[PDB]
């Protein structure tokens, strides 16, 4: 390509080019206002149009990195605003771009983006659509410097669709608020998955990453030969390793190359991928990454005639240990798309341990003969956990399920603070409501994918303020042991009940004023504080106190007196509760 910027403009398109340039300059320049980024985007777009008109212009033949670095260094306020980032302008390429990458401030110091009223949002969307959508996109980009730009563009398109849909109805709030909350949760989950995968590739290792990719791609592509799966795994591992470095252009190029290979080798990968290969380059890899699992062949036999029964198994293992292990992992993942990736990894680790232990001794057939029975409990452990919690979800709604989870996880570990406990338990209740609505053939992957980010958030909260050692021990282990370590937690017999605080168990007239959500937050906080002050409370006593509280607040809001009902009857309720427990 003579002009790389002209190729980018012709492939992506004018609107996509402007959006991506804005997102990139906001991820790099985070303290400049919106108008400066708008002017920079307009100048870059005009230059790209001049390059498209003639490929032999003044500065059209130079690379994208040099043009981007020059546009970054043309900022007159760069030094006085950034300090260190301005020193990268003295470097050459690719040292200058690497220096700019090292200075991407993650989690900067900016005020949080408050959500305005639905009426104000719709009014601003109608009066000026572009300068509103792009303004919010610039804010989100400057607040998330390492977020993948095409994903941010996809989320922005979804937000624009939601705004166009809801602002044209009678009740705009009842339409917009659920969509806004769902989009916020999805964006948080996407960022959490990205950062977690990068941290796992850094800490755990390429071997664990390749095992995870083998399991995933074998579950997604069961009709593929193991050689194709292994090549795809190596390519995807390289792609993720290059994307975790931070260079957006090289990450996009690697993803595009992988998507091109997949769309060219469709005939040897899957059959449910024809739709994604017709989309442009911006959406091709995004569609491929979120494709359904292909149907497996029906004539697939058991894994007994190739891993336990037939001979030459120890020979194939000693000739290539990790190759045979990945072969077994792929052959096991292709059979069970309903299993979680961590479960298949545990099975592979167990098989590896059994082979390593019972191959340096004579007559190894008798050792691994009864080795598939060891897979029975490990498979039944999550299955028994799922179709019991949904059972509880069948007995109690999402709110009561979250309350029961709060009680349980406060009895198990009371050292954790109240707001973090409440947030994690509400997230767990949402996860249960989301994944229990699926049949038993898709519950485990949903639960795994959601519990991953839930426990990740729990531990990024726990690391900044460590309280209990057991919580830090559950995350300092392997990713296949986080959920087992957390489920192995029991009630804390070493915990001492904190002294009674009458100020915490006080309610006022504003409780009836708060919305349907904040009132639940306050009730859950009160429940957590009650469980923490009285941990030895049984189920009957807790249920009785909860019923007394429910009858107390319901007899004060819809009554005659407003203020002299919470401090009057509440003084009796707290004493009645302190009598028991
Ligand atoms: O296996 Al090989 O540590 Mo070839 O060796 O993890 O480090 Mo190539 O990547 O991977 O391209 Mo690396 O160049 O490098 O388990 Mo570890 O069977 O016996 O080795 Mo095995 O010929 O065909 O390491 Mo046979 O390619 O290594 O596995 O023992 O490949 O044999 O394999
Ligand atoms: C529908 C499908 C999706 C379902 C998802 C269900 C729940 C949603 C999952 C995401 C949780 C998450 O991921 N939450 C963060 C995000 O961020 Al944030 O541990 Mo991250 O130490 O900082 O105000 Mo980003 O505080 O202490 O709690 Mo905002 O949490 O509101 O730390 Mo808010 O770097 O930090 O993560 Mo606290 O890992 O970069 O703006 Mo640790 O920071 O948006 O809010 O960014 O990190 C984490 O990405 O806050 C919270
Ligand atoms: C999640 C990343 C979104 C990036 C695109 C933002 C488009 C406009 C969003 C407006 C709403 C922001 C979130 C909210 O306040 O609920
Ligand atoms: C096709 C890739 C072959 C090389 C990678 C093999 C990885 C085998 C891992 C077996 C399970 C160990 C536990 C784990 O990886 O988390
Ligand atoms: C200054 C030039 C800025 C160019 C911005 C280009 C952003 C990358 C677009 C990549 C589109 C495809 C993404 C993918 O395939 O994963
Ligand atoms: C998240 C609230 C509880 C309801 C769902 C419980 C799911 C438990 C099993 C999780 C699936 C993955 C198991 C594993 O990590 O191997
Ligand atoms: C401070 C603790 C907050 C909640 C911690 C939850 C830990 C993960 C739980 C995963 C599901 C376990 C279900 C169960 O306990 O049977
Ligand atoms: C310790 C004396 C006061 C205890 C009051 C109960 C603590 C809050 C429990 C909330 C249960 C009801 C929840 C609801 O229905 O909204």
XYZ file of C-alpha atoms and ligand atoms in Angstrom, residues 107 144 185-186 188-189 191-192 195 427 450 457 460-461, ligand 2:
63
model
C -7.691 4.802 35.320
C -11.148 3.906 29.196
C -23.305 -4.048 32.424
C -22.241 -5.447 29.043
C -18.212 -3.491 32.160
C -18.208 -7.239 31.476
C -13.646 -4.615 29.784
C -13.347 -7.071 32.682
C -8.226 -7.183 31.329
C -24.247 -9.351 40.971
C -20.310 -14.552 34.521
C -14.403 -7.521 40.500
C -9.897 -6.144 42.484
C -11.913 -4.693 45.363
C -25.299 -8.363 31.200
C -23.889 -8.893 31.062
C -22.942 -8.439 32.002
C -23.137 -8.777 33.464
C -22.221 -8.246 34.463
C -22.700 -8.282 35.963
C -21.919 -7.256 36.780
C -20.994 -6.300 36.025
C -19.564 -6.699 35.877
C -18.397 -5.723 35.924
C -17.781 -5.309 37.240
C -16.572 -4.356 37.081
O -15.727 -4.532 36.207
N -16.633 -3.309 37.871
C -15.594 -2.288 38.077
C -15.465 -1.463 36.772
O -14.526 -0.353 36.929
Al -13.625 -0.103 38.612
O -12.083 -3.859 40.662
Mo -11.193 -2.092 37.537
O -11.207 -1.742 42.113
O -12.809 0.028 40.307
O -16.269 3.513 39.643
Mo -12.759 -0.129 35.412
O -14.918 1.606 41.157
O -13.633 0.248 43.153
O -16.077 -0.603 42.369
Mo -15.287 1.794 36.460
O -13.894 -1.952 41.431
O -17.552 1.223 40.372
O -10.798 -1.716 39.399
Mo -16.126 1.803 39.661
O -9.693 -1.600 36.888
O -12.065 0.042 37.602
O -12.386 -1.899 36.047
Mo -14.543 -0.172 41.796
O -11.169 -3.812 37.550
O -11.241 0.399 34.839
O -15.386 3.511 36.410
Mo -12.123 -2.171 40.735
O -14.155 1.691 38.461
O -16.192 1.267 35.128
O -16.566 1.393 37.831
O -13.495 1.637 35.774
O -13.236 -1.974 38.722
C -14.262 -2.950 38.425
O -13.688 -0.551 34.044
O -15.249 -0.357 39.570
C -16.127 -1.425 39.224
